[PDB]
Amino acid sequence: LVPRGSHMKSLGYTDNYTFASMLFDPGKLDSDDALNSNIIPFDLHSYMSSGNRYKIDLKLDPIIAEHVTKISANPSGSNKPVEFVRNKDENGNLTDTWEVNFIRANDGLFGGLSQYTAKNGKIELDDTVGNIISNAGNLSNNKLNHQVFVRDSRENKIVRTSESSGYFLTKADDDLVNLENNVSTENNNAFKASSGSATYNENVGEFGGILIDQQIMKNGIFSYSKTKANQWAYNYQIDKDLLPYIEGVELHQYKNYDAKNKVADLTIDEVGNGTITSDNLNKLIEFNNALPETVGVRVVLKLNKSVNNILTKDAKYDSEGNLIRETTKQKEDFTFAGYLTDSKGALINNTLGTSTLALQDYDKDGLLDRYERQLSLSDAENEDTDGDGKNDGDEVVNYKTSPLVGKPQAADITTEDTVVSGSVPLKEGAATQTAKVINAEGTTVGTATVNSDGTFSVSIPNSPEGTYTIAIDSPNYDNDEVNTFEIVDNSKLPAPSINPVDDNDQQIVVNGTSGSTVTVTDSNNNVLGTVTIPADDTSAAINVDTPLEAGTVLTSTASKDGKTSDVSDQITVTDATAP
């Protein structure tokens, strides 16, 4: 079982334009009959143009997933079921996603753009649906969500164009249930099924946007043409909780966003509902008249502020303006619906599509999972990716520093030294950094490019004694990561420093004044190595036979001209594959 209080990692996206959107078409959960069954039936529809690389993934609401004993469906053109297998994550924890091969010839669901339907789908449960969903909250506000997509099993990513979502209809969805129960006679066999997808697009407007794309698959070659008086209407429902974040709502003709595709401004009422019609609906919706191609409809929600502000609603901040992580939401689902009606308000058969936007802040740092993956490149499952003690959102928003660049470190030097040597933690997405040595009055006295491993060697003049700043400058952030170090009287012997060492490193890099000899010992004072720092540098290398075990603690002292320095700050060897 999936235990209480567990959360699922979201998946990144990959592109593969050969996969059309999949459409999960379940039975409704809105009757005593349906509620007294232990089966939720479904069909699965898709369009396809070899191998087991690409999988079909079905992800079910936890209320449902907790009770699932078996999921199966007949491949297209067959009457023999194939069974879905419950996925496990990057370790051995169960997810709420069930998986089956895509291609029927590879024991999958589709095949022998063509249209295929896998029929007789059955979600089998260990109790009745009614007993299961009677242990839920307000199903008007928290829906029973579903999502379907093709997963690239080589990359563990979602094929962007395959994704579809929605929610099961219950008695709580009374307006949509009444629509399903009052189907129009007009073009009653035109459409086979409909589903939606809701995504975030940073390129919409100035704050990004939400795209709500509905697909309506055809049974044949439907052609829309009505008199002015018999024109249909398009109807849409926008989750009321998004309304504080929406600047405008637009209809686009319809995967990339392009403002040139705008065909109307849309209005919504106080609960997020709207309707649009026309003297010729062909001007607003591309019905692909007399072609078999799926009808697409796009609704665009232009945000009025960063998408990262939604789950942080009601968030509190400390004295220094940093997010109190306990005050933000870790996830939030928003639901949407769209459908066509005839001129009397009756539902055009099979044109009702729902969708779910599943926003997540897995690590409660204020940056949505998908924002971290697509924009900042910070880790979506670590609230402090670089380890510097400033959390990712705070860094992007408050400090305006890179969340991929930790705190620089530089050993003290003397007035006779000509190089400031040190290092800084750089995380996998970090840009190319520039290190600067700046005196107390704000004058830059040296600059260099930080190497990819974080080390740097900044050339400086023989410089006046005092407190200096080592600043690490990213091109993507306004502010540098800073630390201070000392340039001391040249009769002094400052403590050296040790660069970070992991259990894959055969060498220990040390920094210290030129001509001093630096000796490194572990917690048991075993001399692991000694090196004299050369005449025109302030860093040197120690070589060891075998790398050090993760957890061993390192210190160092330097000696020169009869002086012995204080001990360096300790350095702990880390695991070479821990981020």
> Which residues here bind Ca ion, judged by CB under 5 A?
61, 142, 145, 361, 363, 365, 367, 378, 384, 386, 388, 390, 392, 401, 405
Contact in structure between 301 and 242 (CB atoms under 8 Å): yes
By beta-carbon proximity to Ca ion, the closer residue of 57 and 392 is 392
Minimum CB separation of residue 368 from Ca ion in Å reads: 6
By beta-carbon proximity to Ca ion, the closer residue of 152 and 372 is 372
By beta-carbon proximity to Ca ion, the closer residue of 170 and 187 is 170
Minimum CB separation of residue 366 from Ca ion in Å reads: 7
Minimum CB separation of residue 47 from Ca ion in Å reads: 28
Q: How far apart are CA 284 and CA 196, in angstroms?
A: 18
Consult the annotation and say whether 145 binds a ligand. yes
Consult the annotation and say whether 372 binds a ligand. yes
By beta-carbon proximity to Ca ion, the closer residue of 341 and 356 is 356
Q: How far apart are CA 336 and CA 197, in angstroms?
A: 9
By beta-carbon proximity to Ca ion, the closer residue of 343 and 484 is 484
CB atoms within 10 A of CB 321: 10
Minimum CB separation of residue 90 from Ca ion in Å reads: 17
- Among 572, 570, 529, 565, which Cα is nearest to 412's? 565
Strand boundaries in 429-552, DSSP class E: 434-438, 444-449, 455-459, 466-473, 481-488, 497-498, 507-511, 517-522, 527-532, 539-543
Q: Which residues of 513-523 are buried (b: 16+ CB within 10 A; e: fewer)?
A: bbbbebbbbee
Minimum CB separation of residue 454 from Ca ion in Å reads: 13
Q: How far apart are CA 269 and CA 274, in angstroms?
A: 6
Q: How far apart are CA 279 and CA 132, in angstroms?
A: 47
Residue carrying the six token digits 């022998």: 112
Minimum CB separation of residue 214 from Ca ion in Å reads: 20
Consult the annotation and say whether 405 binds a ligand. yes
Consult the annotation and say whether 390 binds a ligand. yes
Consult the annotation and say whether 386 binds a ligand. yes
Q: How far apart are CA 496 and CA 566, in angstroms?
A: 8
Strands 481-488 and 413-414 turn out to be parallel
305: Cα within 13 Å, side-chain hemisphere: 11
Residue carrying the six token digits 């044949």: 220
Consult the annotation and say whether 561 binds a ligand. no
Q: How far apart are CA 503 and CA 511, in angstroms?
A: 20
Handedness of CA 387, 393, 398, 403 (dihedral sign): positive
Consult the annotation and say whether 30 binds a ligand. no
Consult the annotation and say whether 365 binds a ligand. yes
Minimum CB separation of residue 401 from Ca ion in Å reads: 5
* Alpha carbon 401 to its chain's center: 21
By beta-carbon proximity to Ca ion, the closer residue of 10 and 555 is 10
Consult the annotation and say whether 481 binds a ligand. yes
By beta-carbon proximity to Ca ion, the closer residue of 400 and 563 is 400
Minimum CB separation of residue 44 from Ca ion in Å reads: 21
Consult the annotation and say whether 288 binds a ligand. yes
Minimum CB separation of residue 165 from Ca ion in Å reads: 11
By beta-carbon proximity to Ca ion, the closer residue of 64 and 520 is 64
Task: State the residue number with the nearest CB to Ca ion.
Answer: 392
By beta-carbon proximity to Ca ion, the closer residue of 40 and 103 is 40
Cα distance between the two ends of the chain: 29
Consult the annotation and say whether 402 binds a ligand. yes
Residue carrying the six token digits 């002086």: 563
445: Cα within 13 Å, side-chain hemisphere: 21
Could you tell me which residues are annotated as the binding site for Ca(2+)? 61, 142-143, 145, 288, 293, 361, 363, 365, 367, 372, 379, 382, 384, 386, 388, 390, 392, 395, 402, 405, 481
Could you tell me which residues are annotated as the binding site? 61, 142-143, 145, 288, 293, 361, 363, 365, 367, 372, 379, 382, 384, 386, 388, 390, 392, 395, 402, 405, 481
